[PDB]
Design a protein around this ligand. Sequence first.
Ligand SMILES: *[C@@H]1O[C@H](CO)[C@@H](O[C@@H]2O[C@H](CO)[C@@H](O)[C@H](O)[C@H]2NC(C)=O)[C@H](O)[C@H]1NC(C)=O
Ligand SMILES: *[C@@H]1O[C@H](CO)[C@@H](O[C@@H]2O[C@H](CO)[C@@H](O)[C@H](O)[C@H]2NC(C)=O)[C@H](O)[C@H]1NC(C)=O
Ligand SMILES: *[C@@H]1O[C@H](CO)[C@@H](O[C@@H]2O[C@H](CO)[C@@H](O)[C@H](O)[C@H]2NC(C)=O)[C@H](O)[C@H]1NC(C)=O
Ligand SMILES: *[C@@H]1O[C@H](CO)[C@@H](O[C@@H]2O[C@H](CO)[C@@H](O)[C@H](O)[C@H]2NC(C)=O)[C@H](O)[C@H]1NC(C)=O
Ligand SMILES: O=[N+]([O-])c1ccc(O)cc1
Ligand SMILES: O=[N+]([O-])c1ccc(O)cc1
Ligand SMILES: O=[N+]([O-])c1ccc(O)cc1
Ligand SMILES: O=[N+]([O-])c1ccc(O)cc1
Ligand SMILES: [Ca+2]
Ligand SMILES: [Ca+2]
Ligand SMILES: [Mg+2]
Ligand SMILES: [Mg+2]
Ligand SMILES: [Zn+2]
Ligand SMILES: [Zn+2]
Ligand SMILES: [Zn+2]
Ligand SMILES: [Zn+2]
Lengths: 481, 481
Amino acid sequence: IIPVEEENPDFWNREAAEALGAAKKLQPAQTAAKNLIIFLGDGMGVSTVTAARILKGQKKDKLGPEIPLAMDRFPYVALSKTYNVDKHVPDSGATATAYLCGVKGNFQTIGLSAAARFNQCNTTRGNEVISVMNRAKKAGKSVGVVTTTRVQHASPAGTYAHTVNRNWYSDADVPASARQEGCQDIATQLISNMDIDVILGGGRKYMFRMGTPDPEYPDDYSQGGTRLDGKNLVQEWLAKRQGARYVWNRTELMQASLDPSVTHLMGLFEPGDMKYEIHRDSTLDPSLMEMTEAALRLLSRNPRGFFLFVEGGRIDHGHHESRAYRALTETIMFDDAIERAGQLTSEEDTLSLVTADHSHVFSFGGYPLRGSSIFGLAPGKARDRKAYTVLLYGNGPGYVLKDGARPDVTESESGSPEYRQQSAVPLDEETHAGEDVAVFARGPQAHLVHGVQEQTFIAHVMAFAACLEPYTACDLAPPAG
Amino acid sequence: IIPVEEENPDFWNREAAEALGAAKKLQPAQTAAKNLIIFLGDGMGVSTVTAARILKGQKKDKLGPEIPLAMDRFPYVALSKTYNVDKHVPDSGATATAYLCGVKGNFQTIGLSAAARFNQCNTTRGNEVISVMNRAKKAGKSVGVVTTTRVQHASPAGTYAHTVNRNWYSDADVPASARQEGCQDIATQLISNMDIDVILGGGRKYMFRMGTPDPEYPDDYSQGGTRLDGKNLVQEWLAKRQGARYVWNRTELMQASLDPSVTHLMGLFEPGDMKYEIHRDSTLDPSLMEMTEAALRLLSRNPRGFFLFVEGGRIDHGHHESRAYRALTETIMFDDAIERAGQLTSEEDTLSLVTADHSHVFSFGGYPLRGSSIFGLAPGKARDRKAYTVLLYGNGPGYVLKDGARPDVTESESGSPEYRQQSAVPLDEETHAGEDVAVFARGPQAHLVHGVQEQTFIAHVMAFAACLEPYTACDLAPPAG
Ligand SMILES: *[C@@H]1O[C@H](CO)[C@@H](O[C@@H]2O[C@H](CO)[C@@H](O)[C@H](O)[C@H]2NC(C)=O)[C@H](O)[C@H]1NC(C)=O
Ligand SMILES: *[C@@H]1O[C@H](CO)[C@@H](O[C@@H]2O[C@H](CO)[C@@H](O)[C@H](O)[C@H]2NC(C)=O)[C@H](O)[C@H]1NC(C)=O
Ligand SMILES: *[C@@H]1O[C@H](CO)[C@@H](O[C@@H]2O[C@H](CO)[C@@H](O)[C@H](O)[C@H]2NC(C)=O)[C@H](O)[C@H]1NC(C)=O
Ligand SMILES: *[C@@H]1O[C@H](CO)[C@@H](O[C@@H]2O[C@H](CO)[C@@H](O)[C@H](O)[C@H]2NC(C)=O)[C@H](O)[C@H]1NC(C)=O
Ligand SMILES: O=[N+]([O-])c1ccc(O)cc1
Ligand SMILES: O=[N+]([O-])c1ccc(O)cc1
Ligand SMILES: O=[N+]([O-])c1ccc(O)cc1
Ligand SMILES: O=[N+]([O-])c1ccc(O)cc1
Ligand SMILES: [Ca+2]
Ligand SMILES: [Ca+2]
Ligand SMILES: [Mg+2]
Ligand SMILES: [Mg+2]
Ligand SMILES: [Zn+2]
Ligand SMILES: [Zn+2]
Ligand SMILES: [Zn+2]
Ligand SMILES: [Zn+2]
């Protein structure tokens, strides 16, 4: 459909004039950032962003592509080069090292330089690289990790852990030789490496000994504790801190986030990853946006500021399943969380970066009409006289041959939350993609986010803006009020 | 392969420190742009850019992803929203209207507001939107159109033409009713609508009457003149201007570009589109980089400055064939032309924008090792136990079923210049993609290129920087020396 108002050149001329005016108004801060927020859309490449924009636009009864996402309103944009040292198409572990520690590493390692080797515990020591979040804590800031994945997953783990193997969630995952050599599982590192004021997400199971019933699924043993060392990491964590509270559900999170006496908060809301937003139990589980607000309630209390990590962690997972409906609905909730954080913090003193660790082989094509569903069919048949979808994958589990040929697709089918878009190559999981991702930035020193940068730049600009090591001689004035 | 130097965190810390220093040094101009250059990579989305970077990096005996493209060195980056008014996934015609005239239009129309309708001649009048190039000419600047496609193709046509139908190359293409109603073919508009100082690219055939032997293929009648109105548009064009020269080959282009008496230059180097760079006859045909230099030699003579359009027009075509080797080799030559223009002009007085009209459903995935060929196989077999390529398409003519199944692929095969990467959906031509593309900017007022913008912003920022209508009251100081 053609919006009548857009037929008039004046519409476009007025908008562009408005855009130029806004562009001219942009000025760099002379002051430091009190607070640092990184919003990480795991797997949220450029094609995910645009597709999510269209979906969200239509959610609010608009045509789609013309409505800005919250992230679209960020003034400063750069392209981020995501390659790991050893692989062109990266993983979450080694990209975390780049955007959180400012050093590139090798595929599937976390918080380690590329002198380390994956799954070789004895290459660990001397290669630990300290995250910006760790450095923010050392400077007396409060720090928060918020994600819809396990809190021990690769991305959040980049804020606190150093490991040659991202799969080492609990001691149960670490080979005897590595345990003997002192390589700690990530759940242990979560509670031991550094003080973290707010930890919100999934990953209950790795914190408790085998046999421990999950409090929310006490009748499903696969959801229970995983530990073989007899440790209760939650109790150990609680015992280390006065003001500390552990919650496993939304109601308790709410109570804690408003409780003046709660100084340390660990909320682990599922045994593993949190449910997709479309499957979330809104009585039992906080959304990413709600966890973000909960984190902000506690973190904002520290006069010295905070570092907050917020991950749209299951965007990635949606794409891996080649279920764009899940990828994009996670992306919109991620954008809602970004919007909410913006309402609760001031760009006068808060440097906010939105980025992705890497992209996916997700594409948005065909020649669909303005206002058509992103989950719809491309107008016109493919060369095999069957329909195809506007959303497709290069590879992944949507590759199907029914009776020797590519199956036809209907709108009802293509529009289902369970639908897997077709791909060129069958894989159990769709792969990451290696192309540049966006960095969006707002707040003090955000203007430094520019051009085409190595992914490591994200960590460095944040450390610089807050005058953290190695930029304590930042030469910036104190954060603005 | 893991580069030893990258194993040391110092390598990454030093680079990022260097990046921060460079970022801090950036300052906005207070002065206008004397010259305007738009480099348009047709179809050159984010995944094309990164893939081209890797290929070019390895061309110069490096690992790939760590080596900047010429365009990567541009300080200012924005994301551009490419939707046409009527379609989410756009064409070149209506995107040209946006980035050249500053108004969005309807799919397959050029230089017209969205009140016009495709292929309806009688909806033309009153909807003409004037390009920045036209406005630059009105202000006394010299103007140049340089492309590897027909000069009457959608992109270059956006600089000078207004038509409801991009397919109207010569009068032979225009229906009788439209001819009767005064809708001029693009070749006529090329010579009639405005004065253009330099016109370089393909499209000889549309300029000459049927029966006219092409001077370069006088034995292939399909390459001859197409016109049914008896017009020789080249002679008509030459007759309109003293100092005017027509060339159809590289040697004559060279001579003209250095000739002080040549004030108007039309070089049409193929009957239709120019050959892919990999097929170019370097004795008969100028590369895009050479045409760019030829254009610059003449355009730079005007003390009032110039507007130059330079298109990597066949990047798009490579992707349509799903032959990434062609898409990416065109992209590298486009980047070489960008580099060359930068050596021949000063960012003190020249605003240079590099962008794409739209992207393609091209993806870069699998998990290939550092330094591996971009045209190589993903490590490890697909779910069907056959190999697959790191480069794939969502749709297009690389979809194959040999004997009921996805064919295996070898490195020798995947690496051929004729190889079509596989896709999920068979189409004669791979489709454009609707996701945001990059805008890169350098020079006076380039800092205004920021954030996420409508594609129309490209035209407006250029007009504003040069203080052209509708921004003659730009409030900028004269261009710097
Ligand atoms: C990490 O530990 C492994 C396992 O013992 C070491 O690998 C051995 O190295 C020796 C000497 O090169 C070889 O002869 C053996 O074949 C290796 N054993 C295995 C099981 O692979 C390795 O050298 C250690 N690396 C460091 C940094 O100490
Ligand atoms: C959220 O978690 C709280 C804290 O564990 C749960 O509160 C317990 O509920 C049981 C059963 O109703 C009671 O016997 C206890 O008094 C509660 N424990 C504490 C320490 O408060 C609560 O039930 C959970 N909410 C939901 C909806 O499951
Ligand atoms: C453009 O020309 C076409 C062709 O004559 C016009 O279309 C006709 O419009 C009348 C009135 O609505 C219809 O009864 C006919 O069916 C149409 N004919 C065809 C061939 O489609 C159209 O109205 C013209 N538009 C303008 C702006 O004048
Ligand atoms: C490039 O174009 C020029 C100009 O048309 C060609 O020059 C002509 O060549 C023919 C055959 O050799 C001569 O009879 C004429 O004297 C030339 N014409 C003019 C006006 O100079 C030239 O041959 C072309 N070059 C190539 C390599 O084909
Ligand atoms: O032994 N276990 O793992 C158990 C036992 C009881 C229960 O409700 C849950 C788990
Ligand atoms: O847990 N919290 O602090 C919350 C919970 C729900 C909500 O809507 C906002 C904040
Ligand atoms: O009639 N024609 O189109 C012709 C005739 C002669 C020739 O060499 C080329 C084309
Ligand atoms: O036609 N030209 O002006 C040219 C031709 C070739 C070249 O290498 C540079 C410029
Ligand atoms: Ca739960
Ligand atoms: Ca030629
Ligand atoms: Mg993650
Ligand atoms: Mg083009
Ligand atoms: Zn990831
Ligand atoms: Zn992933
Ligand atoms: Zn195009
Ligand atoms: Zn195209």
